[PDB]
Amino acid sequence: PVKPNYALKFTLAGHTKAVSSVKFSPNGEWLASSSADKLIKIWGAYDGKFEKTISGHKLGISDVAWSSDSNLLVSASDDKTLKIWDVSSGKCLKTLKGHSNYVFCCNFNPQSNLIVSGSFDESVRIWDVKTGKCLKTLPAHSDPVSAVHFNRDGSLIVSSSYDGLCRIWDTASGQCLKTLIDDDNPPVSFVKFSPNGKYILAATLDNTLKLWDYSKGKCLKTYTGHKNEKYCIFANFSVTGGKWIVSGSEDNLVYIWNLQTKEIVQKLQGHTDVVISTACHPTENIIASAALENDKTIKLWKSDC
Numbered sequence: 469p470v471k472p473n474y475a476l477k478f479t480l481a482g483h484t485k486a487v488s489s490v491k492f493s494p495n496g497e498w499l500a501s502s503s504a505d506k507l508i509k510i511w512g513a514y515d516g517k518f519e520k521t522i523s524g525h526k527l528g529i530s531d532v533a534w535s536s537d538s539n540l541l542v543s544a545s546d547d548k549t550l551k552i553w554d555v556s557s558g559k560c561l562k563t564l565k566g567h568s569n570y571v572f573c574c575n576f577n578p579q580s581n582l583i584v585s586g587s588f589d590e591s592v593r594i595w596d597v598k599t600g601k602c603l604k605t606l607p608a609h610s611d612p613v614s615a616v617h618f619n620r621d622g623s624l625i626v627s628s629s630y631d632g633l634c635r636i637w638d639t640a641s642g643q644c645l646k647t648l649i650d651d652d653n654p655p656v657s658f659v660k661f662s663p664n665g666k667y668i669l670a671a672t673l674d675n676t677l678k679l680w681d682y683s684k685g686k687c688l689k690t691y692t693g694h695k696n697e698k699y700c701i702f703a704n705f706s707v708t709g710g711k712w713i714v715s716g717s718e719d720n721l722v723y724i725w726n727l728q729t730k731e732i733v734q735k736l737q738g739h740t741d742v743v744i745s746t747a748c749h750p751t752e753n754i755i756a757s758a759a760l761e762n763d764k765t766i767k768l769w770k771s772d773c
């Protein structure tokens with residue numbers, strides 16, 4: 469339809485400090501969350517039912533990501549490591565050591581034989597999942613790296629940084645293939661490829677989201693009306709029903725825009741602190757949102773379209 473009708477269905481409480489990231493498993497069954505409380509929690513994606521806690525990091529966790537088969541998780545921590553987890557057993561399979569400071573972001577490639585990470589140390593690292601060895605260290609940026617993401621076939625990596633740049637990397641060679649810069653270079657707080665891999669969605673700490681044609685190297689859409697000047701807030705493409713852009717905001721709301729018209733179609737009220745993370749379910753019209761220290765809860769919202 470014209471607008472979605474997301475309504476609050478479940479509030480997931482359990483973390484005792486700020487929640488940093490929420491991610492749906494590719495198979496749609498689970499939600500994983502990470503927190504400053506050093507814990508990963510697993511929850512039912514459709515019922516919000518608490519499943520289990522996964523522990524081991526020595527400091528707070530900034531991000532979590534699923535393998536393509538929904539069996540593994542990778543986490544990125546202030547303790548300067550990433551950990552690879554077998555979700556079913558809760559086992560830490562590997563600890564990925566190499567970054568010299570806080571690890572902020574992580575992702576598996578589609579094949580899930582590789583992990584990419586970004587750190588406060590200004591590097592992007594590519595890791596082998598099976599051995600846990602660092603395969604490449606990319607001298608990616610001149611300030612902390614806020615996000616890293618593989619494209620649809622894993623041949624490219626996009627990275628964003630407080631240095632105001634988005635960079636595109638060849639996975640195989642580690643070569644920088646593109647540096648994206650618009651009219652200014654405010655800190656880039658988030659970036660990801662579109663599902664089809666033709667565009668990149670990037671957030672900057674000037675209350676702006678932008679859709680880029682990275683190949684042409686041109687900004688196609690701009691999304692505004694939300695508050696984002698301090699925190700690295702995750703954004704998403706919603707594609708299960710109407711085509712939306714979804715993001716958290718520092719006014720405690722989840723914002724939803726029409727991708728094409730750039731109009732705000734919904735604002736979701738409920739959280740009591742900054743909404744730092746949102747996720748969109750892979751097959752159903754379900755959004756997960758998570759908030760910082762004064763809230764500590766995760767919310768599941770559902771729409772008919």
Ligand SMILES: Cc1c(F)ccc(C(=O)Nc2cc([N+](=O)[O-])ccc2N2CCN(C)CC2)c1Cl
Pocket residue numbers: 486487488489503504505528529530531532546572573588612613614615630700701702744745
């Ligand atoms: C709750 C919590 C932690 F326990 C640890 C780190 C963070 C955090 O702010 N991570 C972060 C830091 C920077 N930075 O200072 O350059 C940039 C990006 C992130 N994040 C926020 C969480 N997003 C899922 C991943 C990237 C957060 Cl929110």
